[PDB]
From a paper:
A more important factor contributing to the low prevalence of the GII.13/21 huNoVs may be the GBS of the GII.13/21 huNoVs, which is easily interfered with. The function of the GII.13/21 GBSs appears to be easily blocked or inhibited by low-level glycerol molecules, suggesting that other small molecules with a glycine link structure also inhibit the GII.13/21 GBS. Indeed, we also detected a glycerol molecule in the GII.13 08N2045/2008 P dimer.
Author numbering:
A (entry chain A), B (entry chain B): 3 to 310
């Protein structure tokens, strides 16, 4: 059997699998009312991608397609989504939405670029500041269309356009809810083909998250906007490449200080692609910057982790 | 000895190592007057990062630091840099510039985000559209500071800030020159610690590039802006992880169709981290979307490739 492995990376050498920014922290907390069911960054340990997960961090929360004028004060345009190649999106694919589609509720902010303009048009005149809100009835990426609310710049009708994500935004009636999935089909249909929700099931355990601060371009004054993922993008890509057979349901892993060899904590890496630790309460881990994970062994369902 | 390998990735499954966007094409061209000496996406086959190369595509052309008011006409603020991971930047570090610094001459466009603002401040009011020009006298990232030119938004003095790249720009006196390295110390000092320039040394050979179209927010009307890299970011990260010893100075690689194994063409993968092919002239390669490179064997500098 091909041996299971992890890449050797410090946490600042990891990318959030739900937004194209580096990991900053490890964080554990109880689920309490959150249904932890993100659709990006989902991969089994033997290499099966799930949800809307694909391999490129530069495609997470990125969209492209053709703009269409829309008679609405919020979504002045729609984006008719296309694959990177240029073909129209196919809603019959067995996925929740185009791969990389945002998997949090609220407003995604970024920049739309369109047909290039002459230099004399002015500075950054082919850059449009855009809000993509999931509370809009026009957010229907599974059907092949999303709504664009423009803030700066004139969005041209019927031009091949790219959206580059920058951060999130909170306005007066649209909170940022990272654990509330969008309705990928709007009100036409419920979500389909979802990666499963995850939770600790062993006494005393909590999920462990790879945590980043996402830029927030409106609202959340004096507050941190966090985006938490279950696997860094580098682990998704590693498991996809390696496709090592999963020998049990749980891979025992440990986070070590490479200088002293000390185990800072051990953790369960579940075969469906998430981590639990033995802890009770909200806890941003205090860990040395050079620490990294190592794979120990495949364990059974009744392994009791050392408290951390 | 650990065997050298390449990741199993199609070209649309890889990221440009000089700008955070997916690869779109393979492209070969003669060097003619270009000094091909990019500093991002530089890595030896045995895993030694060079130039300004680091591991995260989400850090390429990204900057972070503290803003400082400036009385220049072009740059209303400077950004006092750190490393993209947040580690303090010392100009005495043995690098050309902070890792991920842009390695093309011209204008980089993106969005600065700063301290979060109240909802009532307005839409995208913590998003500033920025030009970072390498021809500005304040582009001195090696010294620890770059100039920020405001287009949209009010850049705040003395705030911790993040710059997210979106594309490039061409104004009336600043062309986009992807093979002219910036002066990382401006006119104050010469460039240091550079990864070497590369060129075909064998008869009938040209460099093979991984090519993307970069968004252009001003200028280049009717034209596509291209950014060409020597190695995909995923190859950089793979060589860094594997650190397989290079048995000779040249690895023979084959671009194959994985279904059957038929070789479409062969190429030389050089020890310092670049590819050559046997071709004369500018040529965007025609390749099936499912093809990928595969390591064949170690050869020398005088292996004669089949023309392609």
């Amino acid at each position: 059997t091909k041996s299971f492995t992890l890449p050797i990376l410090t946490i600042s050498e990891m990318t959030n699998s739900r937004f194209p920014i580096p990991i900053e922290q490890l964080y554990t907390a109880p689920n309490e009312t959150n249904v932890v069911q993100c659709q990006n960054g989902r991969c089994t340990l033997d290499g099966e991608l799930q949800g809307t997960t694909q391999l490129l961090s530069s495609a997470i929360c990125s969209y492209r397609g053709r703009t269409l004028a829309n008679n609405d004060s919020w979504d002045q345009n729609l984006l008719q989504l296309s694959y990177p190649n240029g073909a129209s999106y196919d809603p019959t694919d067995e996925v929740p939405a185009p791969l990389g589609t945002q998997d949090f509720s609220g407003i995604l902010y970024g920049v739309l670029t369109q047909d290039n303009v002459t230099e004399g048009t002015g500075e950054a005149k082919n850059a449009k500041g855009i809000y993509i809100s999931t509370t809009s009835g026009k957010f229907t990426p599974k059907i092949g269309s999303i709504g664009l609310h423009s803030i700066t710049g004139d969005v041209h009708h019927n031009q091949q356009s790219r959206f580059t994500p920058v951060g999130i935004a909170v306005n007066e009636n649209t909170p940022f809810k990272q654990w509330v999935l969008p309705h990928y089909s709007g009100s036409l249909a419920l979500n389909t083909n979802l990666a499963p929700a995850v939770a600790p099931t062993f006494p005393g355990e909590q999920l462990l998250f790879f945590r980043s601060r996402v830029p927030c371009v409106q609202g959340l004054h004096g507050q941190d906007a966090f985006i938490d993922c279950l696997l860094p993008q580098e682990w998704v890509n590693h498991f996809y490449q390696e496709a090592a057979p999963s020998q049990t349901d749980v891979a025992l892993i440990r986070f070590v200080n490479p200088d002293t060899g000390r185990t800072l904590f051990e953790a369960k890496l579940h075969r469906s692609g998430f981590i639990t630790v033995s802890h009770t309460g909200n806890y941003p881990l205090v860990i040395p910057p050079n620490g990294h994970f190592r794979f120990d062994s495949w364990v059974n369902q009744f392994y009791s982790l050392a408290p951390m």
